[PDB]
Amino acid sequence: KCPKGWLDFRGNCYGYFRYELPWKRAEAWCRSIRAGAHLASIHTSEEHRAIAKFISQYHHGEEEEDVWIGLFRWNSVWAWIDGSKKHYSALDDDDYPKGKHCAVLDESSGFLSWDNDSCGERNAFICKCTA
Numbered sequence: 001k002c003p004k005g006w007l008d009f010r011g012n013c014y015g016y017f018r019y020e021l022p023w024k025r026a027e028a029w030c031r032s033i034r035a036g037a038h039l040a041s042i043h044t045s046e047e048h049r050a051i052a053k054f055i056s057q058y059h060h061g062e063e064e065e066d067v068w069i070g071l072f073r074w075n076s077v078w079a080w081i082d083g084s085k086k087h088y089s090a091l092d093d094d095d096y097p098k099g100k101h102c103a104v105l106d107e108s109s110g111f112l113s114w115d116n117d118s119c120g121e122r123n124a125f126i127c128k129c130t131a
Contacts, residue, residue: 012128012131015034017029017127020123021068022121037129041128047088048088056110060107066124067105068117090114091114
C-alpha cells in the first residue's frame with residue numbers, strides 16, 4: 001500500500017520530489033506530505049541500489065541534480081534525522097572545515113556516492129516512510 005508513484009521496497013515507501021528546498025525545509029515537507037515520513041535513511045547497499053534506480057528513471061536537469069537524504073552532521077558526528085541507528089554509509093568523510101553538514105546522493109555518480117553539501121543549498125529530495 002505505497003502511495004501512487006512511490007517506490008515500494010522491503011517494507012518501506014520512498015517518495016522522490018523535485019521541489020528544490022534547503023535541507024531543513026525538505027525534512028519539514030516530508031513530514032507534512034505523509035504521516036510518519038522523513039528524509040530517507042539508507043541502511044543497506046541493496047536499499048541504496050533500489051533508491052538510485054528509482055531516482056534515475058526520472059527526467060533530470062543537465063547538472064546540479066543532487067538529492068537530499070536524511071543524514072546530517074551535528075557536534076562533528078553524522079546521524080539520521082529519522083532517529084534510526086546508522087548501519088551503512090556511502091559518504092567519504094574527509095578533511096573538510098567547509099561548513100557542509102547535510103548529505104546528498106550525488107547525481108554525477110548515478111547516486112552511488114554520498115556527498116556533503118551546505119544545508120542552505122536547494123536540492124531535490126527523497127522521503128521515506130514505513131509501509
